[PDB]
Design a protein around this ligand. Sequence first.
Ligand SMILES: O=C(Nc1ccccc1)c1cc[nH]n1
Length: 290
Amino acid sequence: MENFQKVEKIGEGTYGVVYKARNKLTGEVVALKKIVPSTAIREISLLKELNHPNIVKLLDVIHTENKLYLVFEFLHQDLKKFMDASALTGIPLPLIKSYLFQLLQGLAFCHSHRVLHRDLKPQNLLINTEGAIKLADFGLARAFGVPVRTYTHEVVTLWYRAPEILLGCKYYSTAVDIWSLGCIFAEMVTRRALFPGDSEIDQLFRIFRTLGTPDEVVWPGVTSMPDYKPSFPKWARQDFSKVVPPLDEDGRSLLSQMLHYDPNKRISAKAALAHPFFQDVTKPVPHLRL
Ligand SMILES: O=C(Nc1ccccc1)c1cc[nH]n1
């Protein structure tokens, strides 16, 4: 793209290379994602107007030469790197709370407009020096699908996938985002992925081992889902006090609502923002090492 100067490769997304680039005329530093279906282009174009302080701004969609480039506002780190970096001591709780709180506001805005993310994970949550956190790649899964592998063959993580997706639900809802963020919330607290599955069945059985194998009691309709098997093992549900120590009762309360099996009972982003866990929410500045 003649209007951009590629500064460095920052990464490899599910769809293609991600470049840090500068706009040869505006002087703007952006993130440039290289990714043609008529449908995809209309979908992405609606994303241009879905603007919120906690959603990485899509600056521009450039379709040229059967090539597709998305131009995003640039943020200097993602949450996965920040968590790696905060391994020894953990992300402090007030900062975990502010991030979750901001992320929920993000989801509440998108969701109210009926946009799902569908592939939330720490690599697409981006952070700046001001204490902000923002969701990247919102709405791209609807436009482009979610591949078992990326363009580089790197395996798409299953770790944050809602169970109604793993059980083959075709028509899942906004609740699938709530589930992922719940998994991400647990991970920040404990410094270990909640459910790090390495196949769909491992992913599901890991969920079952912690949350209880789901039945008709906790999840009406579950036994009628496409990939449900009466032969699944029947595991007992563990207490959250064991799962996310040393998270407090309000935290554990909210986490459990975000991880309800039935997507209809799963707490919405909007209700979550009202939960007492956020009574004392503040906005700390992290220390970043740019
Ligand atoms: O990927 C982006 N930025 C980034 C991520 C990790 C490390 C350094 C920079 C990005 C995507 C959209 N804006 N920024």
